[PDB]
Write a protein that binds this ligand. Structure first.
Ligand SMILES: [Zn+2]
Length: 50
């Protein structure tokens, strides 16, 4: 058997850098409540890849 020396099955998890008001988010303001994380690892400015 292989018990494994891992910590958790979830490694790629996101969160909401906002709040939940009027049944709508303030960070992304998605349509549903259980929507997929909005705060993704991205940025406008950065060393473009060549
Ligand atoms: Zn959000």
């Amino acid at each position: 058997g292989s018990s494994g020396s891992s910590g958790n099955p979830h490694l790629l998890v996101k969160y909401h850098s906002g709040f939940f008001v009027d049944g709508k988010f303030l960070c992304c303001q998605q349509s549903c409540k259980a929507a997929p994380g909005c705060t993704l690892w991205e940025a406008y400015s950065g060393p473009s890849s060549g």
